[PDB]
Design a protein around this ligand. Sequence first.
Ligand SMILES: *[C@@H]1O[C@H](CO)[C@@H](O[C@@H]2O[C@H](CO)[C@@H](O)[C@H](O)[C@H]2NC(C)=O)[C@H](O)[C@H]1NC(C)=O
Ligand SMILES: *[C@@H]1O[C@H](CO)[C@@H](O[C@@H]2O[C@H](CO)[C@@H](O)[C@H](O)[C@H]2NC(C)=O)[C@H](O)[C@H]1NC(C)=O
Ligand SMILES: *[C@@H]1O[C@H](CO)[C@@H](O[C@@H]2O[C@H](CO)[C@@H](O)[C@H](O)[C@H]2NC(C)=O)[C@H](O)[C@H]1NC(C)=O
Ligand SMILES: *[C@@H]1O[C@H](CO)[C@@H](O[C@@H]2O[C@H](CO)[C@@H](O)[C@H](O)[C@H]2NC(C)=O)[C@H](O)[C@H]1NC(C)=O
Ligand SMILES: *[C@@H]1O[C@H](CO)[C@@H](O[C@@H]2O[C@H](CO)[C@@H](O)[C@H](O)[C@H]2NC(C)=O)[C@H](O)[C@H]1NC(C)=O
Ligand SMILES: *[C@@H]1O[C@H](CO)[C@@H](O[C@@H]2O[C@H](CO)[C@@H](O)[C@H](O)[C@H]2NC(C)=O)[C@H](O)[C@H]1NC(C)=O
Ligand SMILES: *[C@@H]1O[C@H](CO)[C@@H](O)[C@H](O)[C@H]1NC(C)=O
Ligand SMILES: *[C@@H]1O[C@H](CO)[C@@H](O)[C@H](O)[C@H]1NC(C)=O
Ligand SMILES: *[C@@H]1O[C@H](CO)[C@@H](O)[C@H](O)[C@H]1NC(C)=O
Ligand SMILES: *[C@@H]1O[C@H](CO)[C@@H](O)[C@H](O)[C@H]1NC(C)=O
Ligand SMILES: *[C@@H]1O[C@H](CO)[C@@H](O)[C@H](O)[C@H]1NC(C)=O
Ligand SMILES: *[C@@H]1O[C@H](CO)[C@@H](O)[C@H](O)[C@H]1NC(C)=O
Ligand SMILES: *[C@@H]1O[C@H](CO)[C@@H](O)[C@H](O)[C@H]1NC(C)=O
Lengths: 425, 197, 167
Amino acid sequence: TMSLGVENSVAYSNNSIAIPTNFTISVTTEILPVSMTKTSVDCTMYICGDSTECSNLLLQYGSFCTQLNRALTGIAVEQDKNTQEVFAQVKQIYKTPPIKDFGGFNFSQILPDPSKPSKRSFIEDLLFNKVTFNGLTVLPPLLTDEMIAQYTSALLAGTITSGWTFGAGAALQIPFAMQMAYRFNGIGVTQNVLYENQKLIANQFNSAIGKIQDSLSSTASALGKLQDVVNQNAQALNTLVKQLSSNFGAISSVLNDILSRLDPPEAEVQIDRLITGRLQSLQTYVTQQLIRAAEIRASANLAATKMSECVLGQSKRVDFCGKGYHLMSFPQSAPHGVVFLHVTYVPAQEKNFTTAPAICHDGKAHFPREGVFVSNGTHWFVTQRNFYEPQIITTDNTFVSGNCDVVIGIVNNTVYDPLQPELDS
Amino acid sequence: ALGKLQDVVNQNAQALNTLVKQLSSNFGAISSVLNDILSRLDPPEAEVQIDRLITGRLQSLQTYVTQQLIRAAEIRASANLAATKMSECVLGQSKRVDFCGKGYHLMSFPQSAPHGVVFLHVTYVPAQEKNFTTAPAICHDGKAHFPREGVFVSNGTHWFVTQRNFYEPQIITTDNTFVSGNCDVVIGIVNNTVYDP
Amino acid sequence: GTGVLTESNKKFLPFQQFGRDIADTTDAVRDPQTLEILDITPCSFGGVSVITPGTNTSNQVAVLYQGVNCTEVSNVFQTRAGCLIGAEHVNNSYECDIPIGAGICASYQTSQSIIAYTMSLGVENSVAYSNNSIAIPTNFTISVTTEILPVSMTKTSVDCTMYICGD
Ligand SMILES: *[C@@H]1O[C@H](CO)[C@@H](O[C@@H]2O[C@H](CO)[C@@H](O)[C@H](O)[C@H]2NC(C)=O)[C@H](O)[C@H]1NC(C)=O
Ligand SMILES: *[C@@H]1O[C@H](CO)[C@@H](O[C@@H]2O[C@H](CO)[C@@H](O)[C@H](O)[C@H]2NC(C)=O)[C@H](O)[C@H]1NC(C)=O
Ligand SMILES: *[C@@H]1O[C@H](CO)[C@@H](O[C@@H]2O[C@H](CO)[C@@H](O)[C@H](O)[C@H]2NC(C)=O)[C@H](O)[C@H]1NC(C)=O
Ligand SMILES: *[C@@H]1O[C@H](CO)[C@@H](O[C@@H]2O[C@H](CO)[C@@H](O)[C@H](O)[C@H]2NC(C)=O)[C@H](O)[C@H]1NC(C)=O
Ligand SMILES: *[C@@H]1O[C@H](CO)[C@@H](O[C@@H]2O[C@H](CO)[C@@H](O)[C@H](O)[C@H]2NC(C)=O)[C@H](O)[C@H]1NC(C)=O
Ligand SMILES: *[C@@H]1O[C@H](CO)[C@@H](O[C@@H]2O[C@H](CO)[C@@H](O)[C@H](O)[C@H]2NC(C)=O)[C@H](O)[C@H]1NC(C)=O
Ligand SMILES: *[C@@H]1O[C@H](CO)[C@@H](O)[C@H](O)[C@H]1NC(C)=O
Ligand SMILES: *[C@@H]1O[C@H](CO)[C@@H](O)[C@H](O)[C@H]1NC(C)=O
Ligand SMILES: *[C@@H]1O[C@H](CO)[C@@H](O)[C@H](O)[C@H]1NC(C)=O
Ligand SMILES: *[C@@H]1O[C@H](CO)[C@@H](O)[C@H](O)[C@H]1NC(C)=O
Ligand SMILES: *[C@@H]1O[C@H](CO)[C@@H](O)[C@H](O)[C@H]1NC(C)=O
Ligand SMILES: *[C@@H]1O[C@H](CO)[C@@H](O)[C@H](O)[C@H]1NC(C)=O
Ligand SMILES: *[C@@H]1O[C@H](CO)[C@@H](O)[C@H](O)[C@H]1NC(C)=O
């Protein structure tokens, strides 16, 4: 019987609060299919390959072939539409400066490699390494892998040099550590936490990126969702081709043997059976392809939404841009898909404290302007909610509302007045 | 610009036309007109020619209905997106990037269109950016000061604190900033005087 | 059959007279007189696309033979999508106007003719990044943009018996 997880009772009480004293910078990988192979099937060639006797019999079925061709063409066009929507989200082609003074953060393994013919990143090369004549043709995608790599490079450069300003207007430059301070504000952490732990945070980010590289270079089946799409398309085409060996009640499945051995009056009877069977096979293939293409389009719409809301911005949606408090995201092109490296903030080392909703000083109830009241056992401080930074409770930390006869759990403590010593002195 | 709607219309029309044209196919019969078969042949021979038409036309109807199901699923996805956009752009103000247009979403207005909706997304776009020197913090008395809301900027000689999305420089005071620690940690910290009202 | 016969390196056993493919088509044969193995391949085939500006604009068109080399088939240009005939390849790069494939797009431009090119992805823009420089907007614009979303399709009911067996 499977285990649903490790049981864990939360140490809940009416005056106990756990507050993180540290953090970790997580970098998680999310892989989304964006497009699939653009296949085309010449319906007449597949059913009646180079046979006029069979073609004139297939003309009796109306326009069944032309609408199968129309459906496949629509699928092939929407594949390019999917790729364009996901990756053509940057109006200008941004490139990072030759100076990499990004506050100690190292993006060398996600930035392009000029040495290689295709200016892919190291991780993009890992991704592209990890994913592997009967009327059937494959149409090349409109955007080459070099163009998708250029789009991802432009998105990465815009994010790294300007933050989220390039997705709203003109890309406005800002030092990267100040951008990370903006992200820390956006997740509810005061920005002095970023500045005072800048080297630690940068080291954690670099280590997480290195772990991404190691995992990709080690675990072969990392891009299983892309390989699943590739295998599905391969299986569909293999079934379509192998259906050409079915007799469907004819003497032979080879149209040329039937035409060589039989006269037209008897040959037509067998050719009709072959036409019926192969037409059914083509229709089944095209319907399955339409359903699969709808699934791929849904995946690509999700990928474009994630590009916009995680790479071009900082998302407040929970678990939309990775597990944890989203800081930023980096796109990496993958074969027929995209990879998002979600940098998130994970509180790390929490400690128990005694807490109160409010505090009484002079018959007035005080509440934190920002943060929560905590006690280390004897003294009361006001800390920010996602990081333990205790501070003396003053009249700038808090605000008053009414008296102390209403709040449930209110504790007696003194609220320091910064103006009092100045006035007394 | 209205292509997204017209295409849908076209698609529907096309499908129907195809279906109608499938009634002019013999499917192996001597004629694609049923009265011609009935008016010329006896039932024993009429049934043979009618079965082919029945098979072909049933296949055509099944094709039409399956295509309609797939297209209806696509239209359902589009309409769910349109309802989410109505909720989050017309009935609110979205922080989601590029969900209610390109820029910082201010509001949205709906307009009915044939078989569709049009959203007029009003967004805020920064226009005329200037370069400034900037610091992550400021040192006054061995204490590091950080902006409560905004960024420290310098026009070359003097240091102000401005809001981040619009240049409105202001004097750096103890009300614009907050203190946390000393000046031995913050990388890039600069010396300036913090005013005390 | 029909196709192209080429000398093959397949190592037929003495008792084998032909080989078959997955679709059960004869892929190779043994010549009955000079007992050599021949590979049989389909001659050459592929779709034919017509690249046109609006007939309102011009009646001049280019033709793409999809997935065919520029030898089986003015201006002849070998693309990865196939052979393009009637389009003048240009070393400039513009926005994609009519997509051909593999990064190649076609447009009608200036004496006017259809040209093919490698499409541009946008204008290069190196952001003036440094560790103490910040760009801050001093003004703003209010932009109203239109998004069009389909909501419904036409509700159709088909009388099965009247469509198939009308009266
Ligand atoms: C917060 O956690 C980090 C690790 O994520 C701690 O940094 C480690 O500190 C130890 C001892 O000083 C070193 O041996 C490690 O090399 C450090 N790791 C890294 C990645 O720098 C940090 O000390 C923790 N801070 C608190 C207050 O607990
Ligand atoms: C960013 O990280 C890469 C590797 O993760 C660093 O490149 C390494 O540099 C050291 C010494 O400079 C070499 O011994 C390694 O062989 C390099 N590895 C690779 C994969 O190139 C790079 O120096 C880092 N950037 C900065 C600014 O420190
Ligand atoms: C709770 O915090 C207060 C304030 O930090 C602690 O009181 C201080 O303890 C340190 C211990 O070295 C002394 O140096 C300070 O002079 C004390 N200040 C005051 C105002 O008392 C207190 O000990 C802490 N309590 C617990 C249980 O950790
Ligand atoms: C918090 O302080 C207030 C006042 O300092 C306390 O209220 C006193 O309660 C006692 C016991 O009932 C009365 O005899 C006093 O008259 C009250 N003082 C006033 C000014 O009303 C209150 O009890 C304290 N709370 C706790 C939990 O100790
Ligand atoms: C940066 O801004 C400060 C304050 O706005 C400028 O100082 C003022 O410059 C004006 C010039 O018209 C003088 O009239 C004021 O008397 C100056 N005030 C002070 C307190 O110096 C400063 O010139 C600006 N520097 C640059 C390079 O633009
Ligand atoms: C900001 O001011 C402080 C002090 O006013 C400067 O620190 C002094 O630096 C000099 C030269 O390095 C030393 O001789 C002094 O002893 C330092 N004084 C103190 C109190 O630390 C600091 O260098 C200034 N920062 C900048 C960027 O000019
Ligand atoms: C808080 O106290 C409870 C007491 O049962 C303990 O189980 C829990 O681990 C404590 N939390 C922390 C973060 O130490
Ligand atoms: C909190 O829970 C304890 C549990 O014994 C109880 O004694 C106390 O009265 C509670 N506090 C409030 C404000 O109800
Ligand atoms: C900011 O500095 C860069 C440095 O080259 C310059 O290109 C840019 O034009 C400057 N910004 C403005 C608004 O002039
Ligand atoms: C910013 O980069 C320059 C490189 O020209 C360097 O000299 C300077 O020390 C850097 N600033 C900080 C705060 O390290
Ligand atoms: C051809 O297009 C132009 C603009 O693209 C338009 O002004 C003109 O009316 C069009 N011609 C016709 C016959 O509609
Ligand atoms: C077309 O054929 C020639 C020689 O037959 C060959 O050199 C060329 O590479 C072929 N085209 C492509 C695109 O490979
Ligand atoms: C493009 O420039 C190259 C020179 O590098 C030249 O060989 C080639 O002929 C040019 N292309 C055209 C279409 O003129």
